[PDB]
């Protein structure tokens, strides 16, 4: 469970993933969620801090003096709700449900959200599978 | 950066630790912090969700209908502020700064916070170093 780090500190191998697991559990139970993200008809409840920790777009939105207190954010209605759902689940799990039938929507949504590492991954799967 | 998981999903190796790193950066910059924890004279700013994701005590406090909206929580004034600081840094980093001169305070604070895995680690260092 723990090891001697390169610094003096003892480091816990599973800590970061357990935190994320607990954050996702709080999300499932709707505990301390503080924003609803709307993508066309679909609503997604989340924690602002998790969104800011994974997305350049959400970082910018929630550091804007006008927008930081909003409890509802409406995204571009042309964003595919399934693409967003996949990326949100990714944020809270590290797992990206990338499939032939969603990859383009996922990539487009990741670009919009400024998750450049996921965009780059989608490009690489598109190229390597061509 | 990513691998084929045991499930169908692609999984990102550094995602959970990068999230935690970004959460700690938001804490350093005092971005979206929503609670101050007071331990005697000392104040510690934090995100409720991170505290709830690491501590059974903070989970209970912030799921209590009366206490969940409080922006200041006062802990037992006999809690050692350095012990708390070490545990808070642990929550946001996975690194526990465990030393001869703090181990007892860290263990006592972890018990109070219901971080049983850190208590168990402190016990094991006390035993293995006896």
């Amino acid at each position: 469970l723990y090891f001697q780090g390169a610094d003096s500190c003892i480091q816990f191998t599973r800590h970061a993933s357990d935190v994320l697991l607990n954050l996702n559990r709080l999300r499932s139970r709707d505990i301390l969620t503080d924003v609803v993200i709307v993508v066309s008809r679909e609503q997604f409840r989340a924690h602002k801090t998790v969104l800011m920790a994974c997305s350049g777009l959400f970082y910018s939105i929630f550091t804007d003096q006008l927008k930081c207190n909003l409890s509802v954010i409406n995204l571009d209605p042309e964003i595919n709700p399934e693409g967003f759902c996949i990326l949100l689940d990714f944020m809270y799990t590290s797992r990206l449900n990338l499939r032939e039938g969603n990859i383009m929507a996922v990539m487009a949504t990741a670009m919009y959200l400024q998750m450049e590492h996921v965009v780059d991954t989608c490009r690489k799967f598109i190229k390597a599978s061509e | 950066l990513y691998f084929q998981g045991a499930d169908s999903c692609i999984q990102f190796t550094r995602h959970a630790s990068d999230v935690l790193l970004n959460l700690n950066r938001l804490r350093s910059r005092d971005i979206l912090t929503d609670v101050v924890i007071v331990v005697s004279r000392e104040q510690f700013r934090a995100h409720k969700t991170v505290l709830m994701a690491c501590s059974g005590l903070f989970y209970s406090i912030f799921t209590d209908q009366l206490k969940c909206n409080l922006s200041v929580i006062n802990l037992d004034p006999e809690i050692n502020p350095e012990g708390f600081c070490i545990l808070l840094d642990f929550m946001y980093t996975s690194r526990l700064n465990l030393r001869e001169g703090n181990i007892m305070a860290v263990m006592a604070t972890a018990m109070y916070l219901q971080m049983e895995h850190v208590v168990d680690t402190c016990r094991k260092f006390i035993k293995a170093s006896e």
């Binding site: 800011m52 994974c54 997305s55 590492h117 | 990068d18 790193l21 970004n22 950066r25 910059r29 971005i31």
Partner: peptide, 4 residues
């Protein structure tokens, strides 16, 4: 993504 890195928070700046």
């Amino acid at each position: 993504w890195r928070v700046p």
